[PDB]
Every structure is written in C-alpha cells, then in structure tokens.
Design a protein around this ligand. Sequence first.
Ligand SMILES: CC(C)CN(C[C@@H](O)[C@H](Cc1ccccc1)NC(=O)O[C@H]1CO[C@H]2OCC[C@H]21)S(=O)(=O)c1ccc(N)cc1
Lengths: 116, 116
Amino acid sequence: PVIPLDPARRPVIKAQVDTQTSHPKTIEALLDTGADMTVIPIALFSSNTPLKNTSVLGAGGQTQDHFKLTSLPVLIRLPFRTTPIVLTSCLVDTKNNWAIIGRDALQQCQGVLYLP
Amino acid sequence: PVIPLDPARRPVIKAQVDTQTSHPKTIEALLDTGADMTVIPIALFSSNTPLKNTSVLGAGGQTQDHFKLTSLPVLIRLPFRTTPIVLTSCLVDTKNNWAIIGRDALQQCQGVLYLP
Ligand SMILES: CC(C)CN(C[C@@H](O)[C@H](Cc1ccccc1)NC(=O)O[C@H]1CO[C@H]2OCC[C@H]21)S(=O)(=O)c1ccc(N)cc1
C-alpha cells in the first residue's frame, strides 16, 4: 500500500519475524529509509543462540557492544506480500529492543520513496 | 520522482537550505522516513545566532548536548519546487555534520512510502 508521512505518526507495520530459533513472532516495526540494515529485538531469540559482534553508526555516535549480528538468515512476512523476505543477516538490538525495517528489506519488497 | 531503495546506496537529495541567519546553501541531505524532525548542520548558521537545548533519540540511546533546536524557522527548497518548505523548528547537528530530511519536511512535499 501507500503510507503517508507525518511527523506526528511514525510509519509502523506489523511483521511476522522468524529468527529460526523460536517459533515466528509478530512485532510492530518502523519503516526506515535512512537505515541500511534491519534491526530486530533480542526478545525474539532463545537465550542460547549465538550472535556476532559488530559496529554501526547512530545519532549519538556509533556503538561497540550494543548491536549484534545474526548468524542465520531471518525471514519476515508482511501482511500484504505472500512470500517472505529473507535477510542474509540483520542487526539485533540487545538493549532497547528496537524493531526497524531498513533498505535491505525494502529493496526485496521493491519499496520506493515517491516525492510528487 | 520515484526514489528506489537499496541498502548499498543512501537515498539522498540536493536541497537549498535557508537558516535565515546566513546566506542560503545547497547541500546533500538524506531522505529519512524514520526521522520525526529534520536535521541541519551547524555550519549553515551564523557563529552569532542563538540556539536552544533539547533532547533527541538515536542509535545507542539519546544525547543531551549533541543536538540543539533553531530559534528561527528554516526554509527548504527542492529541485522540483520553487515554493519553500517551511519548518517552524528543526534540529541542528553541532558535531557530526548530518543533513537529514525528516517527516516534517516530507509531509509538506506530499511524499509517501509505497510498498507494492
Ligand atoms: C543517520 C541515520 C543512519 C540514523 N539512523 C536512522 C534514523 O531514521 C533513526 C531511527 C530511529 C527512530 C527513533 C528512535 C531511534 C532511532 N532516527 C533518528 O535518529 O532521527 C532522530 C532525529 O529526528 C528525531 O526524530 C525521531 C528520530 C530522531 S540509525 O537509527 O542510527 C541506524 C543506522 C544504521 C542502521 N543499519 C540502522 C539504524
């Protein structure tokens, strides 16, 4: 669909995320064209699964141990599309449990920005 | 126009920004649906103009004295428009030198996200 943009309403969407370590869960993610890579909360994972250290830039700088990478791909189903998005890897937020859909996922839906 | 979304290429636009404290400058800005409010580099303002303190969200927490707020409105002109976007207030980046067009400005352009 078409999602209007409003400073006062964040463009969010309900997504089913399968990390391949639990059963798939539904979360509400921000649609973010300024994010290179998708971010999902660690609350989706079982406490045993391994992750990798990583780096990423942010508004107050870049962090060291805040965000981790998944070892296995992550599958994402959106309400409209029937087939899942498959990300080779994406970021895991261990602190704030942010959920953000980035340009890696938006390219696989062939998403676009449109400015009239 | 249509701006395709690609994890490897940041979606940027060229925008003329008028702080009303110096002469207008054309800069390169990121188009960011995940930003509530537009961010402007402090380099576009006068060394004498007054700014106000405030808070912001961002990857890795929130920062106190990294961003300030403008005291005067900011005007923004796009390539395909001569009528200026008018932001009654927007954020100022005192360090990192980010230029981000957020949803406050995208609303006045009538910009939308489209997911097929
Ligand atoms: C310069 C960008 C790379 C900033 N990012 C995306 C941006 O949309 C974030 C995404 C975001 C959104 C809400 C809370 C935290 C992060 N929001 C943001 O920093 O904007 C702030 C300035 O205007 C304010 O209005 C709300 C956002 C504020 S980011 O969060 O740091 C980021 C960077 C890289 C990845 N892979 C994932 C996320």
